[PDB]
Write a protein that binds this ligand. Structure first.
Ligand SMILES: Nc1ncnc2c1ncn2[C@@H]1O[C@H](CNS(=O)(=O)NC(=O)CCCC[C@@H]2SC[C@@H]3NC(=O)N[C@@H]32)[C@@H](O)[C@H]1O
Length: 265
């Protein structure tokens, strides 16, 4: 109840003023009070012929959020930054589209990293889509492919309490950021995201380099829970040029395109 006082609404006009115009690649930005899924919404626009490249959709509340692999995403009003953007990807080799998702998490991380007084342990990126802080899930990323576009979705916990959404979640407020400004964070996030998308489109090596620098997974003992229910235990060593996780399994290399990572002691 007290957190409500820490959840003023977004300022759509201000965001537009900042993010659309010379020097910026964003073409459209809308804030909606409520929707089922911002990712579904942008996919639907594309499916009816809309050019969603550089289109931004932000929702104050999201009632039927989607996670990876048919899972859900929970939210309460004004507690998160919940957005999707459209990205034209057909100009880029299909084998590289996996990196777009990794780039998105990096952008989210960089957009909020400096708000924390001192970064707790286990703060960075968990492959393939998690921004972690103090071991808690601060943000989740969902990339959905609908050539010629990919729709990139971000759910970032700003003041969202774990008790409201998920026991393994955290938020900026729960990390000690007393009065996070969603307007400022949203603007920084989208600016970081534009830069990373440009880097990705041009195969800039700095993208992979910066991702590696923030990886909590690389070098860690991991259990990876594969689509279909199988588990593989090993040590994460690298991310390949397709954005796939490379594991060391007793001296053998196992490359995973999708899975849920658990960092082990
Ligand atoms: N708020 C939360 N914070 C942290 N963890 C959560 C939350 N809610 C659920 N979980 C857990 O996280 C698991 C899911 N983890 S995944 O790794 O499978 N999937 C994700 O994290 C992608 C989330 C994308 C959400 C963005 S938003 C705007 C856009 N439009 C959409 O509809 N989607 C995107 C769930 O099973 C829960 O256990």
């Amino acid at each position: 109840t007290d957190r409500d006082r820490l959840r003023p609404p977004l300022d759509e006009r201000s965001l537009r003023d900042q993010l659309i115009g010379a020097g910026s690649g964003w073409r459209q930005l809308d804030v909606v009070a409520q929707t089922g899924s911002t990712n579904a919404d942008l996919l639907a626009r594309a499916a009816s012929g809309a050019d969603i490249d550089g289109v931004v959709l932000i929702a104050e509340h999201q009632t039927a959020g989607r996670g990876r692999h048919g899972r859900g995403w929970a939210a309460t009003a004004r507690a998160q930054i919940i957005l999707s953007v459209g990205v034209r990807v057909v100009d880029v080799p299909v084998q590289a589209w996996g990196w777009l998702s990794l780039a998105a998490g990096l952008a989210v991380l960089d957009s909020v990293a400096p708000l924390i007084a001192v970064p707790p342990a286990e703060t960075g990126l968990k492959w393939p889509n998690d921004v972690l802080a103090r071991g808690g899930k601060l943000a989740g990323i969902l990339a959905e492919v609908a050539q010629p576009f990919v729709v990139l979705g971000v759910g970032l916990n700003v003041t969202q309490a774990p008790e409201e959404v998920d026991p393994d979640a955290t938020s900026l407020l729960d990390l000690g950021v007393a009065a996070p400004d969603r307007n400022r964070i949203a603007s920084r996030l989208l600016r970081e995201l534009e830069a990373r998308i440009i880097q990705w489109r041009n195969a800039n090596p700095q993208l992979a380099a910066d991702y590696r620098a923030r990886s909590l997974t690389i070098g860690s003992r991991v259990r990876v829970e594969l689509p279909g229910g199988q588990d593989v235990v090993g040590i994460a060593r690298d991310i390949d040029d397709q954005g796939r996780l490379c594991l060391d399994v007793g001296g053998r290399t196992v490359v995973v395109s999708a899975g849920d990572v658990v960092h082990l002691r």
